[PDB]
């Protein structure tokens with residue numbers, strides 16, 4: 001039980017975050033109202049104070065004499081699902097015959113979509129994102145040919161044994177989900193849920209994953225958040241003998257049921273690495289085109 | 298007949314000139330009222346802006 | 348239907364209208380979203396709101 | 406159904422009867438149209454209409 | 464429907480919600496199970512149950 | 522009446538006679554973690570007045586050639602007062618913040634600072650200039666402590682992103698002819714209900730001159746910029762021995 005006044009009148013513990021704004025339905029662009037001339041003192045819509053941090057509240061109606069316009073232009077194509085639910089390339093896997101990389105007929109792809117600029121720049125507009133996804137796998141030879149070859153795709157979550165060869169015991173796949181498909185079949189396609197231990201994935205993590213001294217040799221882990229590491233995607237030609245053809249698997253991702261928080265400035269320098277925002281210091285370019293003078297087009 | 302809103306809500310054609318002042322009867326000079334001392338802040342009759 | 352509520356948007360402020368044939372709802376289509384917007388959250392997050400007609404600083 | 410009304414004929418004078426399986430109605434079939442006609446618009450756009458029995462100019 | 468009740472779980476303590484297109488119910492999907500649990504059967508199979516607050520042996 | 526203000530919290534009070542209102546980031550006030558959002562089971566400690574108060578941590582000198590600076594939160598406070606002690610003794614932490622950046626001059630000086638809050642402000646390097654070296658920023662640059670750190674390339678915010686779009690984040694400007702301070706209130710921002718005050722910086726505070734400082738020979742040339750901030754609704758959990766990193 002409580003008794004001293006400061007404890008009784010305390011606000012310690014208030015879990016309801018007071019919000020200063022609320023969403024309103026807006027299926028179409030705003031209409032324009034008829035306006036006429038105003039010759040007033042005191043009333044001054046055009047004057048603002050950008051220092052405050054808010055955007056101008058001046059509208060067409062108060063800056064010029066407007067007519068009435070019934071605007072029925074839709075706002076549907078700018079919803080997050082409209083913008084993001086379009087499949088784009090996020091990974092590529094090579095299974096060559098006589099090669100440098102994967103000459104063993106199998107390959108492990110680390111599930112990270114930041115290796116491709118188009119997709120990466122789009123998602124990086126937001127800090128946190130939560131979504132389900134549809135992954136499609138397009139396989140063919142390097143010339144775009146289709147051959148009668150059977151493949152096995154397996155999702156290996158963190159902690160499950162990664163196959164180390166085309167004949168690894170891990171392909172028994174008694175618990176991991178696997179897909180068996182021919183190159184001649186249409187592209188394999190599946191639905192993936194939101195799997196992070198966190199409420200959302202985050203494209204930016206300003207911190208370290210562990211405690212301790214953060215010396216030179218460990219600086220590679222700055223910005224690394226395990227909540228974003230969903231595992232490995234493994235692929236192999238299904239057989240005990242080497243395949244007769246070289247293969248390429250392109251991975252497409254289509255987000256769906258998307259939620260996003262905290263928008264940020266959009267990337268304006270070329271990407272160099274997947275794990276970080278490093279940019280080439282000797283090639284810092286302006287965000288856009290330039291001209292010779294401010295008084296000429 | 299009219300139909301578009303800007304035409305309906307138009308003031309084009311108003312022939313009545315709005316007057317900000319009006320005449321009052323004044324057959325004699327204005328009288329003088331008794332007044333006393335005022336020692337106020339805020340009230341300032343003497344100050345003008347020509 | 349009588350499926351698992353495991354979609355990423357389960358319990359969201361906006362309601363969706365989707366299609367599905369599996370017991371897990373995250374397998375469903377993207378569907379149509381609800382068209383609500385809240386520009387002020389980003390464009391006008393001031394404590395004491397000022398009018399259009401007023402002088403912002405006084 | 407509960408789809409987007411983005412067909413090219415949305416809000417037309419004639420009603421169609423079509424089939425569709427997607428959320429966007431422009432994906433729908435062509436269907437059957439309504440059989441209305443207005444020949445006069447092109448064949449008889451005169452201000453003061455004259456009869457069949459009458460002499461057109463008098 | 465009007466199918467044979469030959470599923471391996473026919474007459475089980477938990478009810479399932481499955482899909483099927485054949486006359487034999489064992490052909491049906493795995494579906495969703497009922498979420499009942501009985502830990503005590505393995506973790507606390509004592510004849511005379513003791514409280515949390517009490518001293519287990521007295 | 523919008524230019525004048527008083528901020529009182531704990532045993533500290535701030536006054537200003539040339540304010541430009543107050544920004545409440547993303548439109549919401551700091552609040553404690555609800556019983557349904559929470560996951561850790563221990564009863565938290567909510568020290569109240571001894572940690573939710575104003576701390577004046579640093580002063581930088583604004584110069585005609587300054588590039589701008591940044592500080593990381595809660596890093597700037599991990600070693601200060603009762604707040605710091607709690608952040609060190611506990612694994613879990615969460616709180617909001619009231620940031621008050623100060624800078625006054627004279628009616629004859631000019632210049633404008635952009636003051637903004639950028640969540641998950643990840644720093645990048647210049648990749649050896651040519652972009653072939655995969656370098657990484659050192660601890661002293663990612664978590665600069667109370668001294669903050671000076672931006673190397675403000676145009677791209679040392680992270681490959683345009684400062685021209687930084688206004689999409691909660692911000693205010695200190696335009697000398699108008700105001701002498703910026704006040705921004707930020708709620709807890711993270712994808713988790715609580716987190717480590719040591720390993721993770723929830724957001725960065727950027728103070729960058731966009732319109733350079735200027736004045737005529739003879740006017741006071743030393744124009745300081747001071748950073749004062751207050752935690753709000755601080756909560757801590759997962760108690761053990763004190764740890765600095």
Ligand SMILES: CCO/N=C/c1ccc(OCCCCCN2CCN(c3ccncc3)C2=O)cc1
Pocket residue numbers: 111112113114135153154155177178179190192201202203204228230233274
């Ligand atoms: C039979 C096997 O089929 N399974 C296919 C499969 C496909 C995708 C899959 O998981 C895809 C998760 C995509 C998450 C991508 N994210 C989350 C955030 N993130 C990230 C990357 C780099 N830095 C920060 C975050 C990412 O790259 C699992 C299985």
